[PDB]
Amino acid sequence: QEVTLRLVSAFPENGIYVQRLLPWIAKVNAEGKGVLQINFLGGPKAIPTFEAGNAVKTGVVDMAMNTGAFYTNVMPEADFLKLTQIPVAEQRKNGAFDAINKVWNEKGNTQYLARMVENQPFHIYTNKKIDKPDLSGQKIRISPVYRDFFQALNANVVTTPPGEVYTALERGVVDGYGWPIGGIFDLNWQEKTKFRVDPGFYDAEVSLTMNLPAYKKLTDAQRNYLQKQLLVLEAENTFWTRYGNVETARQETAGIQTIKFDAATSKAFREKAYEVGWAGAMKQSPEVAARFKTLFSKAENLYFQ
Ligand SMILES: O=C(O)C(=O)c1ccccc1
Ligand SMILES: O=C(O)C(=O)c1ccccc1
Numbered sequence: 001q002e003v004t005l006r007l008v009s010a011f012p013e014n015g016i017y018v019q020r021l022l023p024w025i026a027k028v029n030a031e032g033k034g035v036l037q038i039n040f041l042g043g044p045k046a047i048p049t050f051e052a053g054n055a056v057k058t059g060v061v062d063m064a065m066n067t068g069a070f071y072t073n074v075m076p077e078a079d080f081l082k083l084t085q086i087p088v089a090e091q092r093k094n095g096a097f098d099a100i101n102k103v104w105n106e107k108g109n110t111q112y113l114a115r116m117v118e119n120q121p122f123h124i125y126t127n128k129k130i131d132k133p134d135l136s137g138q139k140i141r142i143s144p145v146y147r148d149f150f151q152a153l154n155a156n157v158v159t160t161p162p163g164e165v166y167t168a169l170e171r172g173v174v175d176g177y178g179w180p181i182g183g184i185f186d187l188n189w190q191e192k193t194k195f196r197v198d199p200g201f202y203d204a205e206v207s208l209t210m211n212l213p214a215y216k217k218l219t220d221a222q223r224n225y226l227q228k229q230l231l232v233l234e235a236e237n238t239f240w241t242r243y244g245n246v247e248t249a250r251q252e253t254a255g256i257q258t259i260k261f262d263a264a265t266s267k268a269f270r271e272k273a274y275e276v277g278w279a280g281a282m283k284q285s286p287e288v289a290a291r292f293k294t295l296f297s298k299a300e301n302l303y304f305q
Helices: 016-031 049-058 076-083 088-094 096-108 147-152 162-170 212-217 220-253 263-284 286-296
Strands: 003-009 036-042 063-066 110-117 122-126 139-142 156-159 176-180 195-197 206-211 257-259
Touching (some): 003 049, 016 036, 016 220, 049 063, 076 286, 088 110, 096 286, 110 212, 139 147, 147 156, 147 263, 206 212, 263 286
Parallel strands (some): 003 036, 003 063, 139 156, 195 257
Antiparallel strands (some): 063 206
8 A cells, every 4th residue: 555666866965956855755754654655765876867867767766856957868858848937836737737748758758747946047157257148268067958058159068967067167177067046055166166147047947757657556546645745845936036046145145256248138148048949949859849839938928029
C-alpha cells in the first residue's frame, strides 16, 4: 500500500533549490506514511547533473528535481520552458501544462509534475566590464539556456554543470557565466564575480519530473496524494519574487556592480533574448515550439500590438 519513490537532484545539495526541495520531501513523508514516501538519493554525486534526465527517462530513478536545460540529450524541447511568461498556476489553466506533459510523455518517457522555481530571470555575470550589449572576446560558462542569446551577443561559450562554475572561475577559464538572479552565493561565486548585467531575461525553470511508467503504476490514491502535495509546493512559489529582491540587494552589498544600459537599449536587449530564443526553439522543433509559443505568452501580449 505504501510506495517509495527515489528522487535525485541535478543541482548541488548546498544550493537554494535543494534547500527548498528537502522541507517539501519532509512534508510528503510526514503526511504520507502508509501511502507514499520519497527517498532523496542526493545531488550530482549520486547521478551527474546532465544524466538525471536520462535517469528519469530510463527509470534508473523515479523522480528528479531538474531543469529541462540539463536534459536536452533526452529531447531538445526540454529547454523550451525557460520561455514561459506566465506562472505555472496559469499554465495549468490555459493548456500549457498539459501541452508540456504531452511532449514530455511522448519524446521523453517522462511525466512533468510541478514547477518549483519561477520568477527568476537569468542574467549575464562577468568579470569583464561592458558598456554595450555585446560580449565579443569573452568566454562565458553556459547551459543550453543561454546558448542562442550569448552566441548572438558574440560570446564564446563553454558548457558546465552548476557544480563546476566555481572551478571555472577559479581557473580563469571563463570571464563570466549565465545564472538566475538568485543563488550565486550558494557555491561561493561572489568571490569571482564583479558585474551583473541588467536586464534579466527568460525565466528559470526548475521542476519535478517522474519516470512515466512509474507515474502510471501509482494507485489512484497515491497519485491523488502526490498531486495534492505538488500543488502545495507550487503555492509556495511566491518566495521567488522575494528571493530575487533579497539576492539583488545582497549582490549590491557584496560589491558586485550592476551594468545598466539606457532604456531603449535595455528594452531591445530583452527583446533580442526572446527573439533569438524562440527562433532557436523553432529551428529545433517547429511544431512544438509554435504551439508552446501561443501558450507561453502573457494574456495581454498574445495578439496584435
Ligand atoms: O545555468 C544553469 O545551469 C541553468 O540552466 C539553470 C536553470 C534553472 C535554474 C538555475 C540554473
Ligand atoms: O527572503 C529572504 O530573506 C531570503 O532570501 C531567503 C533565502 C533563503 C531562505 C529563506 C529566505
